[PDB]
Design an enzyme around this catalytic site. Structure first.
Site, PDB file in Angstrom:
ATOM      1  N   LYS A  14       3.284  21.832 -16.628  1.00 25.94           N
ATOM      2  CA  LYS A  14       2.390  22.097 -17.770  1.00 25.94           C
ATOM      3  C   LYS A  14       1.116  22.807 -17.328  1.00 25.94           C
ATOM      4  O   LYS A  14       0.256  22.209 -16.681  1.00 25.94           O
ATOM      5  CB  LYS A  14       2.022  20.795 -18.491  1.00 25.94           C
ATOM      6  CG  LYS A  14       1.396  20.984 -19.865  1.00 25.94           C
ATOM      7  CD  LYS A  14       1.388  19.673 -20.643  1.00 25.94           C
ATOM      8  CE  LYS A  14       1.062  19.881 -22.120  1.00 25.94           C
ATOM      9  NZ  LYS A  14       1.291  18.627 -22.908  1.00 25.94           N
ATOM     10  N   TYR A  37      11.162  16.294 -16.587  1.00 26.18           N
ATOM     11  CA  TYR A  37      11.769  17.309 -17.464  1.00 26.18           C
ATOM     12  C   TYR A  37      12.855  16.726 -18.360  1.00 26.18           C
ATOM     13  O   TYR A  37      13.777  16.050 -17.890  1.00 26.18           O
ATOM     14  CB  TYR A  37      12.293  18.487 -16.629  1.00 26.18           C
ATOM     15  CG  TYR A  37      13.408  19.306 -17.251  1.00 26.18           C
ATOM     16  CD1 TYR A  37      13.184  20.100 -18.367  1.00 26.18           C
ATOM     17  CD2 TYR A  37      14.678  19.310 -16.690  1.00 26.18           C
ATOM     18  CE1 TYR A  37      14.197  20.856 -18.930  1.00 26.18           C
ATOM     19  CE2 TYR A  37      15.703  20.056 -17.242  1.00 26.18           C
ATOM     20  CZ  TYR A  37      15.458  20.830 -18.362  1.00 26.18           C
ATOM     21  OH  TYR A  37      16.477  21.578 -18.907  1.00 26.18           O
ATOM     22  N   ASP A  87      -0.805  10.130 -31.520  1.00 32.49           N
ATOM     23  CA  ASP A  87      -0.214  11.429 -31.811  1.00 32.49           C
ATOM     24  C   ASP A  87       1.277  11.407 -32.173  1.00 32.49           C
ATOM     25  O   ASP A  87       1.940  12.444 -32.122  1.00 32.49           O
ATOM     26  CB  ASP A  87      -0.499  12.421 -30.700  1.00 32.49           C
ATOM     27  CG  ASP A  87      -0.724  13.821 -31.216  1.00 32.49           C
ATOM     28  OD1 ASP A  87      -0.544  14.076 -32.433  1.00 32.49           O
ATOM     29  OD2 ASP A  87      -1.064  14.681 -30.384  1.00 32.49           O
ATOM     30  N   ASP A 121       3.462  13.953 -23.944  1.00 30.75           N
ATOM     31  CA  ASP A 121       2.199  14.427 -24.501  1.00 30.75           C
ATOM     32  C   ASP A 121       1.273  13.275 -24.899  1.00 30.75           C
ATOM     33  O   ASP A 121       1.136  12.950 -26.061  1.00 30.75           O
ATOM     34  CB  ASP A 121       2.456  15.366 -25.676  1.00 30.75           C
ATOM     35  CG  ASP A 121       1.208  16.012 -26.171  1.00 30.75           C
ATOM     36  OD1 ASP A 121       0.833  17.040 -25.566  1.00 30.75           O
ATOM     37  OD2 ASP A 121       0.605  15.470 -27.130  1.00 30.75           O
TER      38      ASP A 121
END
Ligand SMILES: O=C(O)c1ccc(Nc2nccc(Nc3ccccc3)n2)cc1
Length: 267
Positions: A39, A89, A133, A151
């Site tokens: 990222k 991943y 989120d 995230d």
């Protein structure tokens, strides 16, 4: 961990996503041949937006979480220009793209996603971490199609006083958050109710054409069901979307829900 990585350690592959502050790439670590996601964020953008501390918050929390249903952060590193987060991943993509693709989920895939999610959230909350989120674009798929929360960008420790100027869609945010009050882990259960609905229906229950209007919808908790949502799904979702956080159930009650059990394929 014990190690210090650097860009020259990695072969960058095809880009997975393009965010506002940077992009995620597939990448392999040269010496181990290890596959993962890199990222790439920009000191420029992070700085201008004043999120640097929140980025710190992400890295700490996520790096210290181990759970099958949470995307691992292995580590990080920076150069003159940008910041690099080394991530596990997830080969099957976002739940968002699954949803675009299928446009709707059956009760079984939904109850399953909801179960994995509940487990994950459970692990989080036991640590006083609230994600805040939870949305399908922040949910990823593992090799086995199993859901992984990625995230941790907006997560914090609870309770939180946070008024953080709300950047994106209110679609998943509970009344206490949009309205600028203090909030606790119950935030996530409201979100779980939003998610559940979006999975079955194809759109989040508060969707509107304007921020202001959607904000009205959330505040007044105005939603309605398509005819094809079974009564059990309606009951779970209704129990989950409560103006009063303390009225919202607990992840135990969710995992123990009759609709959840009659449906979920994953304990
Ligand atoms: O072929 C795609 O679409 C895709 C394939 C894999 C994948 N996996 C992944 N793994 C770790 C992090 C990460 N970040 C991310 C999140 C949302 C969108 C893009 C990347 N993505 C994401 C998208």
């Amino acid at each position: 961990k014990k190690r210090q990585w650097a860009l020259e350690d990695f072969e960058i592959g095809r880009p997975l996503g393009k965010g506002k502050f940077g992009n995620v790439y597939l990448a392999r670590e040269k010496q181990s041949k290890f596959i993962l996601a890199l990222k790439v964020l920009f000191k420029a953008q992070l700085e201008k937006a004043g999120v640097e501390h929140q980025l710190r918050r992400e890295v700490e929390i996520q790096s210290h979480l181990r759970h099958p249903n949470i995307l691992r952060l292995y580590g990080y590193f920076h150069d003159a220009t940008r910041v690099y987060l080394i991530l596990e991943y997830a080969p099957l993509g976002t739940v968002y793209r699954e949803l675009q693709k299928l446009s709707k989920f059956d009760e079984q895939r939904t109850a399953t996603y909801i179960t994995e999610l509940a487990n994950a959230l459970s692990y989080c909350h036991s640590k006083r971490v609230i994600h805040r989120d939870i949305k399908p674009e922040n949910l990823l798929l593992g090799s086995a199609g199993e859901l992984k929360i990625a995230d941790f960008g907006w997560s914090v420790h609870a309770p939180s006083s946070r008024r953080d100027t709300l950047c994106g869609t209110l679609d998943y945010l509970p009344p206490e958050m949009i309205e600028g009050r203090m909030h606790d882990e119950k935030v996530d259960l409201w979100s779980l109710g939003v998610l559940c609905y979006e999975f079955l229906v194809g759109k989040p229950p508060f969707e509107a054409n304007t921020y202001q209007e959607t904000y009205k919808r959330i505040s007044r908790v105005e939603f309605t069901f398509p005819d094809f949502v079974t009564e059990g799904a309606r009951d779970l979702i209704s129990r989950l979307l409560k103006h009063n956080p303390s009225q919202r159930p607990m992840l135990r009650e969710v995992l123990e829900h009759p609709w959840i059990t009659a449906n979920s394929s994953k304990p």
